[PDB]
């Protein structure tokens, strides 16, 4: 079963299961650590169960962030109120040395297989940076008299991440929704920690440094995110075609890019010409605000449903919004406020000028 | 019955309305051209500016006194302040002077205009000097020319042009100065 | 263990909390690329334990923006709704103006076909780059920089051309009477009162692009 | 175009998430397609070796394989992620074994080894903590030999021996299309056939993924459909003159009515090779 | 992969060579074919101050030319004269009068009618393959005058230098049939002039505008031409640019991948050794 | 052409051909910066296509014949 | 390449060598067809590049 | 290179000069440095140079200042090895540069 999300990318292309692992790949400062606070913002909240935050290998300062965060919209309750909160913290934050980042996400992990085995319920498990559990074994493998392996990591890179990740699942007794944030270690999605760790998850989200250099927010690169979901029996034919044509028309797009890039879009065919038009406005439409990005964006965050997720991108795929230019897409919920900042945009277009005088600001207001 | 008083400035004017405003106006003709008709002047006495062209040339620009052009009717001649024509010309000896010397180019045909300030602008396709014909070829042609009598009077019109451009070309070139 | 390395030492900068005594440790480090190459090891490192970046490019450099601050990929969200409160009131247009100036340069890197309303956001650009760039070892109080980036985010420097910026920011600082700048450090923002004298103050100065 | 026959072992090596698993499941399940329309001694037995996967994707693979019928013939022999490095080498031994019962007494087998890439990690930890000495990536000297000696037994015996046979379908992953990696150049030395899936072919629409220029069937045609052998070889004969013109026809420069009919029929071949999920024809 | 980067170094500087030879080929074609398009320019202006220049004048029926290229790396001309087509042609628009829309060059033909198709009834082409003679303009202009408007349009590219080429729509008006009829004011500015013909003045006009049709269309499609090859060694300018800034992205991260082949295989040996020794 | 190189150089040529060889490296070396450009042919420029067709000239002079040195 | 062509035998014509290529023993009418063919062959390389 | 130094240093340090060293091709002390760690069996670092390849380099370039008595002042000719400004020997060498002055053909 689906778990929405309330971002247009994740829903729409790589669409999440509600008792699957998930993993978000990112490249340090791609925006995995804002896409997994978005997360739970979004779905922590309407999934009535637990939380498990384990943070591995991340910034004490942002464990303390989610830590008063948490405490100000009440998910973590202090004093005599402690039993009606809903989210356990572990944390083996990168200060820590290597073995005890190595053993954090098992204690996470504990905390989440007692809520699965004996409550007997759904949890949320959220595991900031799977990636340094590895790391911190490759580091202490080094002083165990190993020949290493391939980089320079552990010979039992692909047994360990695989004995701790196959704890990670939902059993006939329980539940565990797993979102993992993965680094990838020099923008290399072919590094043995991230490769090893693909054919763990059910949706692997993966975060493009490139897509965020556009200004596309969330970096999620379309033509590399996978799930399972995205199966026309799982999710319907409406959603999965819509899905397809989508990433058609991008991947159509990268091809031409190529081209575009030395003899530019005066070359193109006019179907080529209609293509990349198209697909530069799907490539806007997949960037999203989010509501934990409005604290320094400014710009507030919106929860775009799946249903206007899948119709609004069926629209921009026939050719309904050709008339829209490129921005009205940029950093929108859904695709009444394309037409609402295209009509801003436009109307923006006269209005620049009086204020000339008649102010509240000369000497004497 | 002159009720759409077009031009640069009226096309200026209406097609900041109908076509998007970041478009610059499309060029036109008339701003390339600093002489007009209507636009007195340009005389200065005895000597008057000369526009003999060509589609593959301009043979004269310069200023010149007398110009003897080939005309339907006959040859004529323009001198400084003469009257607004336009002389559709037989194939003839366009001759320029400029005091004693004559240059004298035997053109093919095609009109040639005197506006009201002077100005005189012969319009001809092509345009030779004399010195570039032979003599031999022209008879040579005639003596085809005056045989292939169809009735076709499409291919009869084409004969009775070459006919008559052979027979003005052969009497030019044996009536030299 | 060269994550470690740096994870154990750029950790240790925090900001305590009041039981501990409230002090702070604010750190910069520094790493050097390799032509450009954010995606090395040690620097997408030290960029996955930072708070933020700053990018400076030779390609800025080299054109005399200095400090060459890429604009586009430099940082800092925890120190952002935590700056001053009158440089956050002016400096949201100067981004989103930056912003878009980057957009039309990203679009025409030649100069042949002008919108005049690019043309407008190309100036301002122009303008903006012009006033962000400063001289060495001489650095600036924050009220002097609210009140060089009010005159230059609104109107006031129109006049002056893509040169004499750099006299006109300085004829600013000078002409301007110097008690908005009390006014300015003691308050913390720019109260309407301070906006009306500062819409006064930067009408009666010699702008030398004239 | 890559026609695969009784005894033949043929690759299928692509990118991360390509169709892999796909063309071999549908390889088995259309087996019991075949099953019940074919008389007893020609009935092709299937295993599936599930190596280093999750224990629940192999859980959606019985699921699938029940709710189909295939498990009637199906064997899964499943090391998964969580199991050891030795039990996660040795079970494309085991699956490999499981399926020359077939093959020895003139029946039919049918392996896929999902993941012989996933094979050569688990043997690459073992070798690596027995203190053998590491050579290519870090992989042992004798992994070449580790895939040949088990490949090799994917053979079509004689008559005397029962005309059994056994089919081999390894896997293998490679990183961003980088065929010419350790195991990914061992492997393409030992089977015959090549299906190469590609990640720009799976986003344009053409599902399976099947690089119709790179695929090769070393077999070929002896072994195909006599009734598609004489259409077929109309089909590769056209498709490949359609991947040069598309190269340059993209530019945009200028179009010849007839090579805008080799890149206009070639669309027709293309749109007419891709297929649905679990739906073998 | 380390292959792969390599041999897209190789296409990326056989790209930037083949444009580098084509900047210089249009820039050799622009010197040789402007000694022949300002030798044209003259005879267009006779018939301007004879016959003046009337682009908004309400015809019954127009036939609008829209000269463009045929080869296409000439890098945004057509597609800015497809777009001045319609803004020129919407602008006739005040009556409902007829309007035949007429490309030169192939790269107008494809492009007119995603505009313009009911409205498309002749595509002149291969015009600038040998070169561009009078003749060839007359028959141009012939074919033309089978269906006989009240009115012409010409649009091309006016070849001011290398650097502009500010489009030009001019005007080309039937001898009475609407030409005659918008020169008489309190009188008429024709009738100062000696028709000087064989037959009448409504025979002289018929053969000067015809002419004017001839000369006006020569003119167009060859300062067309020129301002083709003139946009051409532009954009083949930028094309140089564009792949040596790729090529140069490539280098560096070939050089990476130099380095950390370099490095890895070490690595490998280090290791090979060291489980021995 | 471009890639060999003689750090010693023309102090130890034969005089006479140091005459000769001296220009006919910088004939070659703007054959070289002008060379690949000779598939335009039909597309001709007039000052190139001398040192075009003179470098295709002399890259057929140094062409040798399998053990008859000279 | 040449044999995704369909060319087959797939033997790259300029890179396969032979120590019988000499004239003095294959005689020359051999040995300037062999190095003709290689000629044209290369030159077609060379513009294949641009007919792409 | 060291001892070149040696006779810089003599210069500067007892006659109180304004010295010049001309260390020719810096990258051959360099690779000569990384040829003698490979040889006492050091495990190479980056791209194949010694692990000790900024120290072994700075334990050169720093003995060449300006002292208070007088200065050394170094002329060293850099060859860059693949055309490849960030190779660690010429990006470590770079670190040291006070100016470039690049002869042109
Ligand atoms: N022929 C097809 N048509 C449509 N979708 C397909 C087809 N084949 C595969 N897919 C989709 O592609 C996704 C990946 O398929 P598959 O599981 O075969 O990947 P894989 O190559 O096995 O990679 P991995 O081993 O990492 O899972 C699946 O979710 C499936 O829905
Ligand atoms: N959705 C978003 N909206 C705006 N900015 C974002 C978004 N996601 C990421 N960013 C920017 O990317 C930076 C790095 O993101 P973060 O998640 O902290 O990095 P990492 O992926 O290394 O954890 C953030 O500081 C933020 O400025
Ligand atoms: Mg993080
Ligand atoms: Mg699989």
């Not at chain 2, 001198?79 to 336009?86: E, G, L, Q, W």
Request: with cysteine; charged share 20%.
């Amino acid at each position: 079963e689906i778990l929405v999300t309330g971002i247009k990318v994740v829903d729409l292309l790589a669409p999440y299961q509600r008792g699957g692992k998930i993993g978000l790949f990112g490249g340090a400062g791609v925006g995995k650590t804002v896409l997994i606070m978005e997360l739970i913002n979004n779905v922590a909240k309407a999934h009535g169960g637990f939380s498990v935050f384990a943070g591995v290998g991340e910034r004490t300062r942002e464990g303390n962030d989610l830590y008063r965060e948490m405490i100000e919209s009440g998910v973590i309750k202090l004093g005599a109120e402690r039993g009606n909160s809903k989210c356990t913290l572990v944390y083996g934050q990168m200060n820590e040395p290597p073995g005890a980042r190595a053993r954090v996400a098992l204690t996470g992990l504990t905390v989440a297989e007692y809520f699965r085995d004996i409550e007997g319920q759904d949890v949320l498990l959220f595991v900031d940076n799977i990636f340094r559990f590895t790391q911190a074994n490759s580091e202490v493998s080094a002083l165990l008299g190993r020949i290493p392996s391939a980089v320079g990591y552990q010979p039992t890179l692909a047994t360990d991440l695989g004995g701790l990740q196959e704890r990670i699942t939902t059993t006939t007794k329980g539940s565990i929704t797993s979102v993992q944030a993965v680094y990838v270690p020099a923008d290399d999605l072919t590094d043995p920690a991230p490769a090893t760790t693909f054919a763990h998850l059910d949706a692997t989200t993966v975060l493009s440094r490139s897509i965020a250099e556009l200004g596309i927010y969330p970096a999620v690169d379309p033509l590399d995110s996978t799930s399972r979901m995205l199966n026309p029996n799982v999710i319907g034919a409406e959603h999965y075609n819509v899905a397809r044509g989508v990433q058609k028309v991008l991947q159509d797009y990268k091809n031409l890019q190529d081209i575009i890039a030395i003899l530019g879009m005066d070359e193109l065919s006019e179907e080529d010409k209609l293509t990349v038009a198209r697909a530069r406005k799907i490539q806007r439409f997949l960037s999203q605000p989010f509501q934990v990005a409005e604290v320094f964006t400014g710009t507030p965050g919106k929860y775009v449903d799946l249903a206007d997720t899948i119709s609004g991108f069926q629209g921009v795929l026939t050719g309904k919004y050709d008339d829209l230019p490129e921005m009205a897409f940029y950093m929108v919920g859904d695709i009444k406020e394309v037409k609402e900042k295209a009509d801003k945009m436009a109307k923006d277009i006269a209005s620049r000028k009086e204020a000339d005088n008649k102010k509240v600001s000369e000497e004497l207001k | 019955e002159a009720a759409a008083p077009a031009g640069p400035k009226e096309f200026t004017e209406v097609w900041n309305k109908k076509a998007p405003s970041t478009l610059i106006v499309p060029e036109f003709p008339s701003n390339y051209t600093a002489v007009k008709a209507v636009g007195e002047g340009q005389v200065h006495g005895d000597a008057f500016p000369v526009n003999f062209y060509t589609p593959h040339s301009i043979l004269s620009q310069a200023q010149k006194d007398t110009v003897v052009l080939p005309g339907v009717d006959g040859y004529f001649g323009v001198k400084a302040s003469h009257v607004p024509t336009i002389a559709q010309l037989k194939p003839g000896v366009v001759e320029l002077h400029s005091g004693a010397e004559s240059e004298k180019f035997f053109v093919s045909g095609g009109f040639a205009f005197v506006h009201p300030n002077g100005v005189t602008d012969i319009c001809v396709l092509e345009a030779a000097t004399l010195d570039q014909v032979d003599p031999a070829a022209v008879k040579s042609a005639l003596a085809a020319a005056s045989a292939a009598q169809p009735t076709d009077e499409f291919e009869q019109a084409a004969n009775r042009a070459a006919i008559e451009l052979y027979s003005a070309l052969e009497s030019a070139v044996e009536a030299k100065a | 263990d060269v994550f470690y390395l740096h994870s154990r030492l750029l950790e240790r900068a925090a900001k305590l909390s009041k039981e501990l005594g409230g002090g702070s440790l604010t750190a910069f480090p520094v790493i050097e690329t390799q032509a450009g190459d954010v995606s090395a090891y040690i620097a997408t490192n030290v960029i996955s334990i930072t708070d933020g970046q700053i990018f400076l490019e030779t390609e800025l450099f080299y054109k005399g923006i200095r400090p060459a601050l890429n604009v586009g990929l430099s940082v800092s969200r925890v120190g952002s709704a935590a700056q001053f409160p009158g440089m956050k009131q002016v400096a949201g247009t100067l981004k989103l103006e930056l912003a878009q100036y980057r957009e039309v340069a990203a679009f025409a890197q030649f100069g042949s076909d002008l919108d005049a309303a690019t043309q407008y956001v190309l100036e301002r650009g122009a303008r903006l780059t012009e006033m962000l760039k400063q001289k060495q070892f001489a650095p600036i109080p924050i009220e002097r920089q609210t009140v060089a980036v009010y005159a230059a985010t609104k109107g006031f420097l129109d006049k002056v051309r893509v040169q004499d910026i750099v006299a006109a920011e300085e004829a600013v600082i000078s002409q301007v009477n110097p008690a908005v700048f009390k006014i300015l450090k003691a308050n913390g923002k720019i109260t309407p009162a301070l906006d009306a004298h500062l819409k006064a103050e930067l009408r009666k100065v010699k702008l030398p692009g004239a | 175009l890559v026609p695969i026959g009784r005894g033949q072992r043929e690759l299928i090596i692509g990118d991360r998430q390509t169709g892999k698993t796909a063309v071999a499941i549908d390889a088995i399940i259309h087996q019991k397609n075949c099953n019940e329309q074919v008389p007893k001694a020609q009935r092709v037995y299937c295993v599936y070796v599930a190596v280093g996967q999750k224990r629940s994707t192999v859980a959606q693979l019985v699921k699938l394989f029940t709710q189909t019928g295939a498990m009637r013939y199906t064997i899964m022999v499943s090391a998964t992620a969580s199991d050891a490095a030795p039990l996660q080498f040795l079970a494309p031994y085991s699956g490999c074994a499981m399926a020359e019962y077939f093959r020895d007494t003139g029946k039919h087998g049918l392996i896929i080894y999902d993941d012989l890439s996933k094979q050569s990690v688990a043997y690459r930890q073992m070798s690596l903590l027995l203190r053998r000495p590491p050579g290519r990536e870090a992989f042992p000297g004798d992994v070449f030999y580790l895939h040949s000696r088990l490949l090799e037994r994917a053979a079509k015996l004689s008559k005397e021996l029962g005309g059994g046979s056994l089919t081999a379908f390894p896997v293998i992953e490679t990183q961003a299309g980088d065929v010419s990696a350790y195991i990914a150049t061992n492997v393409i030395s030992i089977t015959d056939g090549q299906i190469f899936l590609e990640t720009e072919l799976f986003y344009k629409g053409i599902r399976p993924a099947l690089n119709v220029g790179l695929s090769v069937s070393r077999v070929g045609s002896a072994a195909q459909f006599p009734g598609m052998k004489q259409v077929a070889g109309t089909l590769k004969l056209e498709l490949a003159q359609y991947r040069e013109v598309a190269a340059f026809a993209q530019f945009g420069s200028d179009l010849d009515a007839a090579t805008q009919y080799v890149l206009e029929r070639g669309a027709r071949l293309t749109e007419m090779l891709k297929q649905k999920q679990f739906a073998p024809i | 992969s380390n292959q792969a980067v390599k041999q897209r170094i190789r296409a990326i500087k056989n790209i930037g060579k083949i444009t580098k030879a084509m900047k210089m080929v249009a820039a050799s074609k622009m010197k040789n074919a402007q000694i022949a398009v300002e030798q044209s320019r003259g005879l267009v202006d006779p018939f301007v101050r004879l016959f003046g220049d009337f682009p908004a004048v309400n015809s019954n029926k127009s036939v609008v030319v829209a000269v463009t290229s045929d080869k296409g790396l000439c890098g945004g001309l057509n597609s800015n004269i497809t777009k001045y087509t319609r803004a020129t042609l919407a602008t006739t628009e005040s009556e409902g009068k007829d309007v035949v829309v007429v490309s030169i060059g192939d790269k107008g033909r494809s492009q007119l009618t995603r505009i313009e198709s009911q409205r498309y009834q002749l595509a002149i082409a291969d015009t600038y393959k040998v070169r561009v003679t009078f003749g060839q303009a007359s028959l141009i202009v012939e074919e033309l005058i089978k269906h006989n408007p009240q009115s012409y349009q010409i649009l091309f590219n006016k070849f001011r230098s290398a650097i502009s080429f500010k489009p030009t729509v001019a005007t080309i008006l039937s001898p009475d049939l609407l030409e005659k009829q918008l020169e008489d004011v309190t009188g008429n500015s024709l009738d100062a002039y000696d028709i000087e013909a064989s037959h009448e003045r409504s025979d002289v006009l018929r053969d000067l505008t015809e002419f004017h049709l001839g000369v006006t269309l020569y003119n167009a499609m060859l300062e067309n031409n020129c301002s083709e090859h003139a946009s051409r060694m532009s954009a083949m300018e930028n094309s140089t640019k564009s792949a040596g800034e790729m090529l140069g992205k490539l280098t560096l991260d070939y050089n990476r991948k130099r380095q950390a082949t370099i490095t890895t295989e070490l690595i490998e040996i280090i290791a090979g050794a060291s489980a021995l020794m």
